[PDB]
Design a protein around this nucleic acid. Sequence first.
RNA 1: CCAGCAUUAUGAAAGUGA
RNA 2: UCACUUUCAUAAUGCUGG
Length: 137
Amino acid sequence: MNALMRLNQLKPGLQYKLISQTGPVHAPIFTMSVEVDGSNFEASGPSKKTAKLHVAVKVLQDMGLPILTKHGKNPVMELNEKRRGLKYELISETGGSHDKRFVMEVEVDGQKFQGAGSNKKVAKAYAALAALEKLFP
RNA sequence: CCAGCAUUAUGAAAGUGA
RNA sequence: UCACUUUCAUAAUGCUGG
């Protein structure tokens, strides 16, 4: 329902610009503008985040209402292609502020694999690649 | 700033049907 | 060429924890 979500669904990669910040520090007023379809809209909001919603709203009103495998593919597809339904499992997660390492584990019916990464998605992929490289090719 | 869960849009790969 | 299901990558939004 949000303007920022919708508007960006329809106008990907769009540049919002801050043109002014007025008012006292404890009660700031931000104003953003954007050009779309040749029209420039300007809206203001209490913060930078919202000022944008307010503009995107105004726009919508006008309109109507990476790690890879030799096969050159991500492993987590390949994995699911060969053993459809494999389950992955978070084995370690460390930190909670800046650096965070995750260590997942996928066992192939009989063989198991593990991989660490900064994102869970990444730690998971590495665990796949390893299992794949090691068993299939 | 880092991370997690969820929804929506675009892209790719695998299977089924016409 | 169209529809449905699974997986992944990118983006956006919402909330939570740090």
